[model samples]
Target: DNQVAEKYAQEIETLKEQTSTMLSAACGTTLTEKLNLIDIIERLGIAYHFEKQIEDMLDHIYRADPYFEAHEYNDLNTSSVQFRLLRQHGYNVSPNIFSRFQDANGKFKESLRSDIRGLLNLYEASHVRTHKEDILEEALVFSVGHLESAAPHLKSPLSKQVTHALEQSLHKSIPRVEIRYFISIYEEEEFKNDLLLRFAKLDYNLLQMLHKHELSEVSRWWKDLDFVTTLPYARDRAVECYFWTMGVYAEPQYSQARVMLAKTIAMISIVDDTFDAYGIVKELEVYTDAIQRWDISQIDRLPEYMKISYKALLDLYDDYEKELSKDGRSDVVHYAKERMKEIVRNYFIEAKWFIEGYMPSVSEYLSNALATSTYYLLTTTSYLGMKSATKEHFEWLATNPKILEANATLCRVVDDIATYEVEKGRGQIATGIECYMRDYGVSTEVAMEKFQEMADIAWKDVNEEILRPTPVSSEILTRILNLARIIDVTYKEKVLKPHIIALVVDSIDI
Candidate 1:
């Protein structure tokens, strides 16, 4: 795989140069062409290869038309793409740029229905909506209505794009999955650039080799631990866990971070199973106490099965500290360990609620359940391997920032909706959905719909925090965003199996 990358080293460099030239030479291109090229680079998952050039282009676009006023006369496809690209780069473009598309009654114009491409772009752009953007709210309803109706009648790649998008929006899709899906669609397009297409295909294959190598190493570690045999109730999802980290950060530079997060997620899954499934009250209390202490001496208090996971958990953090200490950032490990303790503490509370057959209020359950959602812990641990993270970043996260809160809310609500029946069947009475139903005396459907609304608002909150002038850099904020995106792929659609195969098992026929 190293040699595979080496083999393409010269070509990759050449393609990068060529693409950068095209990206930089935007003067001769029409607005649609410029936006389309940027869109392709991003969807092809090669934007990381041209960050500066793309940023420069978007910067120029924003400076030239801060609110897209100059492009207001453009079609929906070009206008929506322009707005999304600018906002994605942290520019403050007004969502009102879409105002021109509406009719006298303030609805999307009826004649726009036949503009399939414009409708599709509007649907995708509306996802970047923040709180109080009512126009985009209506835009979602209008576009979705048309897209669903048009989906069956659409042609080859457009039909494919519509169907896939209605199922999962581009804003919320896992980047690696979207890359694989988009490459096929782009290949069928008549206007696709051959050089860019070739580069995308080769880059995807080369990266897949690296991903497989990483997965093999992680798999070997899990195999050595033998958790599948020893901890029968726990999930043996090593590959799924690694795929999750890819959602968080798929760039080659973040290889260390991805591997570290995968192991952290796997350990969390095992501990989660112990609390959720098998451990008795007495044993769970001891396990929680042991983890809270996080010392090797506490191992003796655990039963046989619990001891195995406990030792691994401690050793994982020890390894994290040792590696981070090399860069003199060992202190950051303390924050991650603290968040781990926080989640375990919340798990113990949920266990107590179950043991008592108690149903907490909606607010009560969410306040605790959010921690148990594991984004807080995962987000903290995700930052562990990032070189850009400083002591201040951990401190910012510790404040329970709104962005992290929204991320956890999205994770908790979506997870509750997806797993409600399973938990209800198991006599688990303290989930967010269950709590909402009991507290409000509502039916399952009503409670689920309410929870969905909460998740929607949480998405708005996340979008708001992702704007410029954030406390942490966008790099750190993106980890939290990607965590929510994985929840969408995992729970909202329940489509992780296909994504896992596309990303890890199947390769493009380069």
Candidate 2:
């Protein structure tokens, strides 16, 4: 997680220097390629790679300075870029900006389809829509249909771009994985920037190396933790959990945070599997009470497996507490520790329902599922790992911020959708789908369709939080976004199970 002696670190910096020089040469005066280039950098995922420069540049250009204003581009390309970079920087560029490209009949021009690049850029920008932006909503519908149809006629790189965008739009795609795909696609450009391309490729490989090392070290931690032997029925998903955190935030700077969150989630999976599969009601009740007491003395009543889980959970939290204390961030530790206890408490409730053969209403099922899904705790711990998160951030998480309530539950719905069938076959507790079916007499397909719609609305809530007048860093918000993207990828099956494996199994050398 700390610095590693990589040979290419300096080389990465050298290439970045060259690219920034070229970057400076742009926006020289024209409402020219510089505007286009900013969007390009974002699409390529290299913008975060140059944080201060781009952040400052975007701020200077539109952050009330309007100093030496850069006029909007005359065409669809420029207008969309203007809308994208501006609102994406939290400017008030509304969906009405696209009205110029529309006809008097109040429809987007038919000829706009011919400019495939313009159409796709508009599509990409359209994702920034909020609840009130009806025009962007229409833009999304139009752009999707237009992009899919345009795909058949597009050639080479453009065709590839359309397919990729359709598969995972700029907003929803995981930034780390998207960068990998973008590097390959950008290489297909007609007039390539050798310096920028090399910068991206080499930076990716170096980060891969850093991730591989961290995964290896954590693998040893997992081996030494050896929950597999003590809790034989629990999942062996340390590697997978690491992948989940990496998706949350993969920058090398957050390397330690990734490892910390990975450990947290790894333990969560084992505890989850324990409740789902292995523990009996008698033992689970005792175990749940022991967790509430949170004293090592209470372990006397737990079975051997629960003893192991309880002790390890305490030890891991202790490790976290000491680490935060080392940095004078002890205030945030209570939220993290309490969330773990809350997750287990909800687990006990779910276990009680299963053992009692009771079916809760969909609302009742969701009440505990929120805590048990490990999101509130997981996300809090995620924020706790970051250097930027403050006491107020933890306080916000404590109250269960509306934006979080909006999006975090989406993952719960997706988790049920993906696993409920298997859970049902295993004679598990009532899942949301099963609850919806029994309570409302809806069909499985219909229940799932509703679940998806709910998750989509949750995403809208998340999108709203990411917009202007934000309380926290875009950096903090992006972690939640990345976690949502993980749900979309693995649980939604958007990229299939193979890519899920690719994130953890393929990226880490292990």
Candidate 3:
């Protein structure tokens, strides 16, 4: 442990020196340089280590010209990066600033096509857009067209970056995984900062060790439960569970919260499997009843297989209550447990719909699927680990706020579209996409497109929620945002194995 702190101490020294340099040089640095450094720091995934400084710097920039309509940011790279960094931090930067880049016909200038760096930044900035930003919408199309065409001709790291951005935009990619990818790209960049690069590598490796330690603890708990043997049908995804929580909050301060969230997520997975994958309608009804009761005595009423999950789920939260009780934060667990029961109740509805072969209307499916998507429970439970989260925060979330609802919409719709074919093959007829297709008598392709559009609009709602004057702290809203980001990164495909290895299993070379 001392050894770990020693490394951490060194990393902090490096971070402080670099942060001091960046901030102290602010007066002398060009606006473009300052923005570029912020972007680099963010992509390097070490921004969490310098939040106050970065926030102060961004705040200064925002206050200097509240709308960011300055001539110094006239170039596409500077303008786009500045807009993204500001808006991402909840500033109310207008998307209309990009109007300068367009021509008389409202098309992006033909001259801008050759500016690959600008196009890439524009592509990225377009993604943070909220509702009805037509210029950003146009920018997305224009930048994507140019980037895709230019990707083949670009050399080395820039080519790789274009391909990576097309596959996963920086706005939505999981931060840790993005850091890992960016480190490799930055290593190859001709103008990379040696100190910054080394610092990022060291910082990432240190956190990976902490994460590894936490995952080992989580794995121990999962192993002791013996769910893989006793309840063999459920997914054995302890690592994935940790990955999900880390996606929500990866700051070092969230270590305990991360562990609690991981265990809760794992238990949720087991209960979800019990409802959908293993239990029959009668058995699932009783299991759901048991979860609603939230009592140890309910275990005896469960089926033989479900008894394991039922007992594990209760014990998991009981452990959470114990941990939180030390800080007198046990009251927060009630909100979280209620959300767990709520999800089980909703899960039963989907199981009933699936087993009975009853296809509900799109509205009915979405209402239930919103809960079954697990974002609401995950989001509520996410706050359970945060020291800043209080009973009031939980109560606000319990109101079904727009942020969580938007997160749910984004997760459910995206998941429905991605999993539609598999659900059909498995005889699960109640998915949102399937319901829409059947209700409107549209082709499967059309239904998918419609669902995709719904997901897009939900993204806008999410973007809107995190802007200034937020009901809660940005810290709280970020957990909700991170849940949506996890969906973007992993829901469409089983592509998390490499990322998991990059983040948890293997350490980056320093």
Candidate 4:
């Protein structure tokens, strides 16, 4: 939309062509640098443009060797990178292939530690490991420890690479956020492709322009609602909510999904903040009733502030119903509406506990709090405009799919940690951290560590769900994966930041 991006559009295309041509120049090189280049293309976020070429090349490699062990791959770095690319694309590779890289003692050769490239590659590859890849477990331990110890001692790119890897492994990192970091680091260190680097910057900027334009569109709706005047107590976070919504799925074609879901999330925030911040238990009872009815006729039962929200809720679905009706996908509107109502209902439950100061056991709290996490709500709502969605997809969302459940868990735990200090500072409701602490008489640190461990196991559940034969389309399942990734970056509570602020106004770390 910007004049600058418009000007650069021609160059992005030209550079893209050059980069793709240079990339495929390795088509005849058997397999040596092919994967390494593919990895670069992927991490750089340009792989979407080369899907057919990458798939065909990888197919050639896969058919050449079902496993790369027989391919005369010399060392840890090359083999490890290739192994990760293959497995990441769903080719099965045994972890046992790395056995020869180890000694009779079942320890990786100590010299491998000196090879930071190999350690880094192996560390990156180990994360995509499925269950019982015991060898990768050892590789993870070995790679992580040595990388940490050597992180400060290494120079320039290596130091940066190790620090970034230690901070967030590629498997767990959000894709958009990863490209932002990779572009800067790639250009600064060993960036031989001027064409590729130029295209990355221009492509990112063009996307940013589109994102900003969409943001402006959504912000207009937020401004017109003027919730700041009508609902003074709630967080005015339309932009932030849109940023999170886009983080779920940001391809150009889904702009309608982005807008509708963004508005839905923004309204959800208003209602969420209403329940958590303003309404007393009795007033919340009225609001909950009206939402349960999901009817404008029941709108009068809501308080003055809530009448506005409740009407907006009905209107969003009415509009959604109209929109989906055009495509004969209207069945999903009802299913999606249920998710929105469920979201508000979950908020009321939390408010009940908050108002009563009702303490729950760790297990008891998570059982409910996880539902209140609103991930399934967000996930279901996100599908509103997708043509690929079906009645079966809605049914699947209704069933509490394990991937969606773990996605909710990841969002809840990470958010609890991110906002722990703020929540404690406010002396508000109990987080899972406090619940665990009160139940076990543990320190805050110990409780947080346990919450993190729970997060780790939940991630494994998320990974396991995404393997083959998933209940939904990969397109649909990708929303869940991406939602999980966004939570890890946005809600992980490591330090300063990771929201759409950097991405939308156009935006990671460990």
RMSD of each: 1.8, 3.2, 1.8, 3.2
- Candidate lDDT scores, in order, read 0.87, 0.76, 0.85, 0.78
Q: Go through the candidates in order and give the clash count of each.
A: 0, 0, 0, 3
Q: For candidate 3, what's the RMSD?
A: 1.8
- The model with the greater lDDT, 1 or 2, is 1
Best by lDDT: 1
lDDT of 2 by residue, 340-377 (tens): 88888888887788878899999898888887777787
Per-residue lDDT over 368-476 for candidate 3, one digit per residue giving the tens place of the 0 to 100 score: 8888888888888887777889988998999999988999999889888777767665557577777898899998999989998998989899999999989998888
On TM-score, who's better, 2 or 4? Answer: 2
Which regions of candidate 3 deviate over 4 angstroms?
Answer: 1-5, 67-70, 276-278, 423-426
TM-scores for the candidates: 0.96, 0.91, 0.95, 0.91
Clashing pairs in 3: none
Worst 10 residues of 3 by lDDT: 421-430
Better of 2 and 3 by lDDT: 3
Predicted candidate 4 versus true structure: per-residue lDDT over 1-510, tens digit per residue = 457767877787777788778767987765667777888878777777787788678767767775456546658987788778776665566777788888997788898888888999999988877667778889999999989988888988778978988888888877877888788778777646766667777777777777888889889988987878877876877677777766776666777888878887887787776776565788899888888888889987867777888888788788888888889987788887787777777777767777788877887777777767878778898888888888899898898878888889888898887778676744455677788889999999998898898788777787667665567766788788888887786664323244465566543221
Query: What is the Cα-based lDDT of residue 497 in candidate 2?
Result: 46
